[PDB]
Design a protein around this ligand. Structure first.
Ligand code: HEM
Length: 155
């Protein structure tokens, strides 16, 4: 239900994973830094996590080769609409090849939601992005502009 995320250099972030083998913590390397994603039903184990309620979920988190995060700033009153602009999501992404999982993460310490989709490869995402099922989700209340970050399985 709950996702915790912390960012930084990957060698360091590994020492955190090895401390909590009991917990399902994914590590991927992005441009600016590496990320730890931690899906659990209870407690964080990061110092200073970014914390999220999972409000939509598909597939499981277990070793994706590629991860894409869309980082969206929603105003405080904006949330209820946005929230149910995603309920409205068709989830045409899920019935697509290479797609391992999606999570729509409601933030608890910021205004920035995160739509996290997990893939087997970059190309799997790169495929879907050019597909029509990208443009039936985008055809024809935000604090500041959204951005996308991307991460690779560990190198
Ligand atoms: C690489 C870029 C993006 C990806 C991968 C992405 C992914 C998604 C997905 C998977 C859904 C809904 C699930 C579905 O219909 O299959 C969705 C919906 C949405 N996205 Fe994005 N998105 C992107 C860019 C953006 C941008 C730039 C904005 C706003 C400026 C945005 C705002 C929304 C909103 C409001 C919805 C809910 C309406 C809908 O169902 O399409 N997204 N996005």
């Amino acid at each position: 239900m709950k996702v915790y995320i912390t960012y930084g250099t990957a060698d360091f972030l590994k020492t955190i994973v090895k401390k909590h083998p009991s917990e399902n913590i994914l590590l991927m390397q992005g441009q600016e830094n590496a990320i730890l994603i931690h899906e659990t039903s209870g407690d964080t184990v990061f110092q200073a996590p970014h914390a999220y309620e999972v409000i939509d979920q598909v597939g499981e988190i277990k070793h994706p080769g590629f991860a894409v995060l869309n980082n969206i700033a929603v105003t405080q009153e904006g949330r209820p609409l946005f929230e149910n602009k995603f309920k409205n999501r068709a989830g045409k992404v899920e019935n697509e090849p290479g797609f391992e999982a999606i999570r729509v993460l409601r933030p608890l310490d910021s205004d920035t939601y995160v739509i996290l989709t997990l893939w087997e490869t970059e190309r799997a995402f790169q495929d879907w992005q050019q597909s029509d099922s990208y443009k039936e989700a985008h055809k024809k209340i935000f604090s500041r502009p959204s951005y996308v970050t991307t991460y690779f399985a560990v190198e």
